[PDB]
Amino acid sequence: EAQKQYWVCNSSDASISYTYCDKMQYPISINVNPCIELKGSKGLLHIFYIPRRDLKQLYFNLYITVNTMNLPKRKEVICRGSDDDYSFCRALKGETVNTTISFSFKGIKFSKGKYKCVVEAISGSPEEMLFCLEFVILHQPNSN
Ligand SMILES: CCCCCCCCCCCCCC(=O)O
Ligand SMILES: CCCCCCCCCCCCCC(=O)O
Ligand SMILES: CCCCCCCCCCCCCC(=O)O
Ligand SMILES: *[C@@H]1O[C@H](CO)[C@@H](O)[C@H](O)[C@H]1NC(C)=O
Ligand SMILES: *[C@@H]1O[C@H](CO)[C@@H](O)[C@H](O)[C@H]1NC(C)=O
């Protein structure tokens, strides 16, 4: 069977999809409202996820590619110490995550072509992979 492609949304200037990278684990549902514009936009990210492991200490390595040019790794801590953490950080393996998160994307000026971001999600520390997603963000060809 062919590899499954997942579509998230189209905005006026972008088209967002992803596939599962690395080992296939539990599925995840992602929705963005309104759809992100490469130019910059804000909104709401909805995640529905039954995690493979506890979300505590959750973090992302980000490998971003900009028209075939790879950028140095980025690491983003999501679930830290004490409160102010998202309520999903206290989720344990098998416990439904069904939440909404605010986001503000600053934008890429003079955007064009195609961008990729691989999200390597690690958690449970003891650290194990949680999931790996490879997002492809196409610039709409009929828009600046
Ligand atoms: C599951 C979809 C992955 C979405 C990728 C978002 C990348 C994270 C951006 C930076 C997060 C740090 C939060 C902050 O301190 O403002
Ligand atoms: C279980 C999956 C967890 C999903 C975590 C996504 C976190 C998105 C952070 C975006 C907010 C901080 C960045 C910002 O907009 O300033
Ligand atoms: C990895 C980027 C494509 C992910 C598709 C869902 C979009 C979630 C918005 C992430 C916002 C991060 C902006 C920021 O770090 O300030
Ligand atoms: C989303 O944009 C992509 C890339 O431009 C395009 O193939 C498709 O027509 C759009 N999807 C829908 C359902 O409009
Ligand atoms: C996810 O959350 C919505 C409200 O945010 C809730 O109504 C819905 O039932 C949840 N999904 C499931 C299948 O539990």
- Ligand 3 and 132: CB distance under 6 A: no
**CA separation, residue 51 to residues 16, 57, 90, 94, 144 (Å):** 23, 13, 11, 6, 38
Q: How far apart are CA 46 and CA 5, in angstroms?
A: 19
Q: How far apart are CA 79 and CA 84, in angstroms?
A: 9
Domain that residue 65 falls in: 1-144
- Ligand 2 and 97: CB distance under 6 A: yes
Exposure string for 44-70, b = 16+ CB within 10 A, e = fewer: eeeeebebbbbbebbbbeebbeeeeee
Residue 110 belongs to domain with CATH number: 2.60.40.770
Nearest Cα residue to atom 6 of ligand 3:
32
- Report which ligand 2 atom has the smallest distance to the Cα of 97: 1
CA–centroid distance, 138 to ligand 4, in Å, is 10
Q: Give the side-chain half-sphere CA count within 13 A for 118.
A: 13
Nearest Cα residue to atom 3 of ligand 3:
135
Technique employed here was: X-ray
- Ligand 3 and 91: CB distance under 6 A: no
**Contact at 8 Å (CB) between 102 and 42?**
yes
Q: Which residues line ligand 4 (CB under 6 A)?
A: 10, 15, 138, 140
Q: Which of 16, 29, 22, 28 is nearest to 3 (CA)?
A: 22
- Report which ligand 1 atom has the smallest distance to the Cα of 117: 5
Q: How far apart are CA 135 and CA 18, in angstroms?
A: 4
- Ligand 1 and 95: CB distance under 6 A: no
- Ligand 2 and 60: CB distance under 6 A: no
- DSSP assignment letter at 88: G
Strand 59-66 relative to strand 6-10, pairing = unpaired
**Contact at 8 Å (CB) between 35 and 46?**
no
Give how many domains the chain has, as a whole number.
Answer: 1
